[PDB]
Amino acid sequence: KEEYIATFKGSEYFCYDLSQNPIQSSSDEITLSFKTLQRNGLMLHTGKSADYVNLALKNGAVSLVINLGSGAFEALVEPVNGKFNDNAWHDVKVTRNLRQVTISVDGILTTTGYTQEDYTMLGSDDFFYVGGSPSTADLPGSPVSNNFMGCLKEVVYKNNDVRLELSRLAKQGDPKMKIHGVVAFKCENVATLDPITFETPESFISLPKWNAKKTGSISFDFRTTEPNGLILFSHGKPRHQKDAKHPQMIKVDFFAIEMLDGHLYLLLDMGSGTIKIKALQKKVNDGEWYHVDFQRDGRSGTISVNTLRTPYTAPGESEILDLDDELYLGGLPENKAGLVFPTEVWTALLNYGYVGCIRDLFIDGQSKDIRQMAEVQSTA
C-alpha cells in the first residue's frame, strides 16, 4: 500500500452506496488530508434526512457539522494567522463518541463540542459522498454549494463495525462505489485546475515547443459550446519548393486538434501524408467537460476522449514529428512570420479560432500553468 490520492476539479465526486450495509453507530472516526486553493468545497458528506455528517471548507476554514436527529453540532476551525486554502496539505481528524465531537487539524489543536438534545446514534443508509455530489447545496447541514477543487487523499471513515477506505475503493473499484467526472488518482498542481477562457475566436496562447521528435503526449480538458475552433496547432519548417505556388503543394510536418461542426478531430502529418481522425462520434459542443489524451510513439498512437480511445497509424516511413518554433492553443497569430497553413486544417483556412475553456494542460506528462502564460503573454 502507498497513499491513495485523487484530484477533484469541481464536477468530480465519489459515491458509496450504504443500503446493503448502512451505518448505525455510537462511535465514529473520519480522517483525511486535503490540498486546495478554493475557499469553499465539500470534502465529504453522508446523511440524507434527520442524521448527517458534512465536512467542508468554508471561507478557508474547515467546517464540520454532525446531527444525530435531536440537533446539530457545527464548528469551524481556521488559523488565526491566515487560512487553509494555501496549496498545502492539511490533515483532519474527526472523532465522535455518542454526543461528543472532536476535530483536530494538523495535529495542532483539538476542538471538542457536542450534539444537541438526547440522540446518541448516527444513522445513514443512503450515500457516502467524497469530494462533491450531484447537488451539494441541497445536502443537509452543508454550508457550501461547491464541490471540491483540489486534492484529497487517505479518506477513511471507520466505526466499531465498518472501515470504509473510500480513496482506496475509488481507485481499486467496488460494486458499491461509483465515481463521476474527470478524476485522476494523483495530485500534481492545484493551480492548474482553474480554467482559462477564450472569450473570442481571435484569442490564443503560444505554449512551449514539444520536447522530442520521436515521442510525445499531450492531455487537457476542454468545454465549449461553439461548433468550430482550432484548439491546438503546430507545424514544422516547410518542405515544398520556393517556386511552389499552390496551397495544395504545401508540405510541412504538423499536428492539430480542431473542432468542426461539433465534432472533434485530430490531424497529423509526419512527412508523408496527413491522417485525420474523428476522436469521437458524438458532437462535443454541449458545454460539458471532456478529457482529451493524445499519445504518440513514432507514427503510431492513440487519441482518447473521455474513455473512448481510438488508435491511429500515420502513413510514411518517417517516425518524427519535426515540429518547429511555437505551439498554439486556442487559435493562431495574425502576423506571424513563416506561419504555414496546411490544406487539411479547415479551421485554420477559415480562421475559426477556439472559444471556450481549456483546463489542466499536460505536455509529456509534465503539468503546465497556462494562467501564468496567459497573464504574461498579451491576454489574447
Swiss-Prot record:
Covalent S-S links between cysteines: C151-C187
Keyword Transmembrane set for record: yes
The record's subcellular locations are: Presynaptic cell membrane
Q: What is its main location?
A: membrane
Residues bound to Ca(2+) 1 are D51, L68, M121
Q: What does the similarity note say?
A: Belongs to the neurexin family.
Query: Would you tell me the protein name for this molecule?
Result: Neurexin-1
Q: Which organism is it from?
A: Bos taurus
Recall the taxonomic lineage recorded for the source organism. Answer: Eukaryota, Metazoa, Chordata, Craniata, Vertebrata
Question: What stretch of the whole protein does this chain cover?
Answer: 295 to 689 of 1530
